[PDB]
């Protein structure tokens, strides 16, 4: 489908943003864990 081929960059970008925010959130949660240990 040409529709899916044209939207594939959009889907890849959406997944990249999703992974970026998820990794950032996990990084942040580990930082709060260290803060609580302190």
């Amino acid at each position: 489908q040409e529709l899916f081929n044209e939207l594939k960059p959009a889907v890849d970008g959406a997944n990249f943003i999703v992974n970026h925010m998820r990794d950032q959130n996990n990084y942040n949660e580990e930082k709060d864990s260290w803060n609580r240990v302190a």
């Binding site: 044209e6 939207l7 960059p9 959009a10 890849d12 970008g13 959406a14 990249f16 943003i17 970026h20």
Partner: peptide, 24 residues
């Protein structure tokens, strides 16, 4: 299809900016 093209442009720009942020 201006709407889908603008969506692709905006999403690609955001992803590129976040990739640059990751490299930084």
């Amino acid at each position: 299809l201006p709407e889908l093209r603008e969506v692709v442009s905006s999403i690609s720009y955001i992803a590129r900016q976040l990739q640059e942020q990751e490299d930084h």
